């Protein structure tokens, strides 16, 4: 009991650089300026005092950047515990 998910506080660090080092590179596909400051442009542009974003370009990047964060920063959770346990 009380250890259903151990912390091991480097997967939150390696998953942090797992969505800044391979996610902030500029690409020629789609003429993107950067992979994530266009995704961080939502706080730069759509941030309003109690008047929030409605019918906006923020909702897409965020819904990808978090989905990439919930597919890479959780992939080290398998990856570090797969080294710790007898998995491969």
Domain extent at residue 74: 23-46+55-88
Determine the Cα–Cα distance for residues 78 and 87; give it in Å rounded to an integer.
10
**What whole-number distance in Å separates Cα of residue 84 and Cα of residue 79?**
9
CA dihedral 7, 37, 64, 23 (to 10 degrees): -60
Domain count along the chain: 1
In whole angstroms, give the CA distance from residue 18 to residue 53: 28
Is residue 7 a part of any domain in this protein? no
- Alpha carbon distance 34, 32 (integer Å): 5
- Give me Rg for the CA atoms of the chain: 17
Q: Answer whether residue 62 is part of any domain.
A: yes
Q: Is position 33 within any domain?
A: yes
Structure tokens at 77: 């959770």
In a domain, 14, yes or no: no
* Most distant pair of Cα atoms in the chain: their distance: 51
Tokens 């660090």 appear where?
Answer: 13
The Cα 19–Cα 36 span in angstroms is: 9
């Amino acid at each position: 009991n009380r250890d259903w998910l151990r912390r091991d506080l480097s997967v939150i660090g390696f998953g942090l650089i797992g969505w800044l080092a391979p996610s902030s590179l500029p690409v020629i596909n789609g003429n993107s300026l950067t992979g994530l400051f266009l995704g961080s442009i939502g706080p730069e542009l759509a941030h309003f005092p109690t008047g929030p974003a409605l019918t906006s370009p923020f909702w897409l990047w965020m819904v990808t950047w978090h989905v990439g964060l919930f597919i890479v920063l959780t992939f080290g959770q398998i990856g570090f515990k797969g080294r710790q346990d007898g998995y491969w």
